[PDB]
Symmetry: C3
């Protein structure tokens, strides 16, 4: 059948696809690929941008409700502060690395015969006022990004306040609504898994055309991306986690020795949740309180922002850079912080890195319909699989780093 | 608030007489200005629920039929309906080509004939089944994407009900429970709208008769006929053969269903009839533990009745527009319609509701005067057709529960 | 850094303080600078409100419809509903009456862009009646078609009640779940308003600051003229209907008020049918209303009481239309006003329902809230809504008791 290690399939689809593309590039048929292979790629891209709205919205409602004070616990408030200070660093490293290696420059895409031309921007007044949806159903209906973010947050928070009410009529109503929204977000995730079953074919078709038509330069450019990620990735573990543990009297060396297979599971399954049974067992091996890890671990699975913050730092810069538009530090963080803010509750979430990207593009007015934007996004989407293994692996490590720092601040260790 | 079907038939029979005399020496135009708006109110009220029912109905439907959520006695009854609908489709088209309903009524209302557009590149029509934004598809009536999303969602929910996580599992249970109920309410609303249907159906044919001459009655009777003969040809040609193939006697089988069919034929309700259906299944000696499960499904998932309705209706509608339609597209459009109606067996006037959904999905704006005036015709006789629809649905539900019961 | 100080106080402070600032900056000041710098805060406030107008009206009506819906409706229910229908009827007539009595809007002929607003007119009745029916309800709901939304929200709520009358427990829990989540969306939308009223002091400051600075000093008289027309019709309701209705039911009106005294005073000051509900029930027991009666009728008047809104709209509608330059007749008025009221059912409060309905009414008529004039006209009412909304609630609560007592003594079982 096709149930064989889904990730194996996708990496086979990428490696094999680039070879097919690239040799049909050299003496081949850039155009034939474009007429015949590519539409299979397009289907894949559509199946992704599809759920981009339901997941962002329904995910944020649930996510907001999670962190919403003071439905949030006191042991919880400390773990929230944790992810906030780490996301802060994860963002800096993101940008830093994306500037350090310069992914995108060197590939000047001008696909229809013309380069893409960002039309910016309205007056700040006009753009701040417009985050407030004129009509919340409509925002959601026709893909209005920022408004949906803002309404989804303000609603998730509202729900929690309703679950602090004496009126039981009221309390269950909220509990019902949130539960229903939850199941939606939940179903959306299961749908993604199904799409990832098609991903090996679709991703084959995507890079096949990119390779066939962009030339061979691309492979260097993509390795440039992945590199900037995995080096910021490990730079995170070493520079922040290890420091934060050191600074909490915890031993970083022996810490790793327990996390070892929990990171390796995460690296391999791409799944904060798939990995969560392993994570929890390791948390116990380190001797974290039962009452603690059984609460804080199922959070970092969803609200851990550090992984995605790194992805976007590099994805953002590549995507904008390949388009040809030179992007500054101020725009960078502006963009990235906003993606991260809105990512909360989508930690995994199969391929959230790429999903946030769409939602961020849609937000900066770069129509996915444009051929350049399209062929640009298609590149990152290709290697997303690779990137998403590091993304999860850092997520999990940081979840343990945090749940162990917070564990010790409760006096429940060994 | 007196027997509802009586009223719709009273209104139709009565309405054509009124329209037809007022047509002849009368004032086709007057009717058009004063009588007709009541008719248009009716068509709107229907096209209204076309979206919610299709979406909500399919989410629920797909979650029924979904693997691994489906049961063993269930898998067989589904396999039953799949292979009966197969044949029901064939008869539909076949009868629709046999009698030629529509041609000979050449409607060109505005002083101009309707002119269907075809067709974007296969590539572009296939990529487009995938909604770019699901809320959007839903919001501004995109048919194929809504089907595609509603199926892919229903299946997803079932996987969530096979989860270790009780939080996850309850949430799915809830979402589904609320979509169901939306579905459910949608139907309740139809029952009420059918309360206006006698006035509405009066107004509709009144105009059609007053304006399209007397040729119409022949053309409509042509439809009715093509359904009722496909209808009984289904009972005899498939059910009887399936009963015989499973040692059940066709003749004495009917002797038991006799009132259950008569009830179905007169209530238009697979569900309204359900108590009578189950009573007969007991009289025939089916296991309690089998008919109490399989009969409530046939009432929702039985595609055979609709499959004949769409076959014929589709061919009439298109044919009357002027557009001659081939066997290939006939089937393609039909499979699509039936394969989206799952979980709406009855569901009062489902037959017509689907038609609207298939029309909106295949070019053909319901706002267009030709398209409108043609759909107004079938909408008129829907009541007649919808009685045979249900009656055959119910017969095939017993045939299925009996065949499956025997294998147990 | 914490302004969790009495929320109403803040809005009143913001109004009085805002008008002075604007008015002095108006005279020799910088109408323009206010427009460029203070106003954007006033606009952000109008956006947060106009935001919820769709979800509150829809999800609110669904629940509302369900609550009045037969035959889920009790016999103790049927009477209280009939009560409210006959009181809203009069509540409307007084609204229009007072709106015509004082003439708010005239004398302020607003032509803001350098051009006066022009209401379009009306398609044939056929076309407007057919169009109350949503061709696609998700679409109605998604892009703000008001009339089709109303009609779908009612026809939905009612259907949901019938599903609760089914022997199929599948069917029955399904309906119960759906309603449970629609309510609760409703409920959350209300919580989101409470947060918006938190910024309302700042926003209401900015709003009148500009209208004062730019519209002159004639505005303050015109607004006092509104509030007057409401508060007098408001007490004309108590004296002219409730008191005549209590008397006509052998009940003593003066000694009735002696119990309601604080129950009305709470409502006047909290702006909250729900916040006041504890105080209200305590008073219905003091008046010696049955426990199994007020435990049902008081939580209804809290949501379905239409009389308070009926007055507000009578005046708001006339002022808004009058200021724009369109003179509006008594037919037009009720047609506009019945409609709003009839669709307000289940939104009694709901922090600021009065203004909320008005948008929804403005959108429905054909006055695009983006229009410079319409905006500057709505902005004025939005400003004093807070004042009007205290009276609104207070009248509502008096009439909930007047009702629960009239129905109560017709019982004694
Ligand atoms: Hg996308
Ligand atoms: Hg329709
Ligand atoms: Hg508004």
């Amino acid at each position: 059948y096709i149930e064989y290690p889904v990730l194996q399939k996708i990496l086979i689809g990428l490696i094999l696809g680039a070879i097919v593309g690239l040799i049909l590039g050299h003496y081949g048929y850039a155009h034939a690929v474009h007429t015949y292979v590519k539409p299979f790629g397009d289907l894949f891209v559509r199946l992704l941008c599809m759920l981009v709205m339901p997941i962002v919205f329904a995910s944020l409602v649930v996510g907001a409700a999670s962190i919403s004070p003071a439905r949030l616990g006191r042991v919880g408030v400390k773990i929230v502060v944790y992810y906030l200070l780490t996301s802060a660093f994860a963002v800096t490293l993101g940008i830093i690395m994306a500037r350090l290696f310069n992914p995108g420059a060197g590939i000047h895409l001008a696909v229809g015969g013309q380069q893409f031309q960002p039309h910016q921007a309205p007056p700040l007044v006009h753009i701040l006022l417009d985050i407030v949806p004129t009509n919340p159903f409509g925002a959601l209906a026709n893909g209005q990004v920022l408004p949906t973010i803002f309404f989804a947050i303000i609603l998730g928070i509202a729900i929690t306040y309703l679950m602090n009410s004496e009126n039981e009529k009221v309390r269950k109503s909220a509990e019902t609504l949130l539960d229903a929204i939850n199941g939606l977000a939940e179903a959306m995730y299961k749908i993604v898994n199904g799409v990832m079953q098609y991903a090996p074919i679709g991703v084959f078709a995507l890079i096949a055309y990119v390779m066939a038509e962009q030339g061979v330069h691309v492979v260097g450019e993509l390795a440039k991306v992945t590199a900037a990620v995995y080096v910021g990735l490990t730079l995170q573990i070493l520079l922040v986690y290890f420091v934060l543990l050191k600074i909490y009297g915890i031993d970083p060396i022996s810490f790793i020795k327990h996390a070892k297979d929990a990171m390796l599971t995460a690296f391999v399954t791409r799944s904060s949740s798939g990995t969560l049974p392993v994570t929890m067992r390791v948390a116990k091996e380190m001797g974290i309180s039962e009452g603690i890890y059984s609460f804080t671990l199922p959070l970092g699975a969803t609200i851990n922002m550090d992984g995605t913050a790194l992805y976007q730092g590099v994805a953002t810069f590549f995507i904008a850079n390949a388009l040809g538009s030179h992007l500054t530090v101020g725009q960078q963080l502006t963009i990235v912080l906003t993606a991260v803010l809105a990512s909360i509750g989508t930690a995994g979430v199969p391929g959230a890195g790429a999903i946030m990207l769409c939602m961020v593009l849609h937000s900066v007015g770069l129509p996915l319909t444009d051929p350049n934007v399209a062929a640009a996004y298609a590149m990152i989407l290709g290697i997303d699989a690779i990137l998403d293994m590091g993304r999860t692996m850092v997520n999990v490590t940081g979840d343990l780093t945090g749940t162990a720092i917070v564990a010790k601040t409760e006096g429940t260790l060994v």
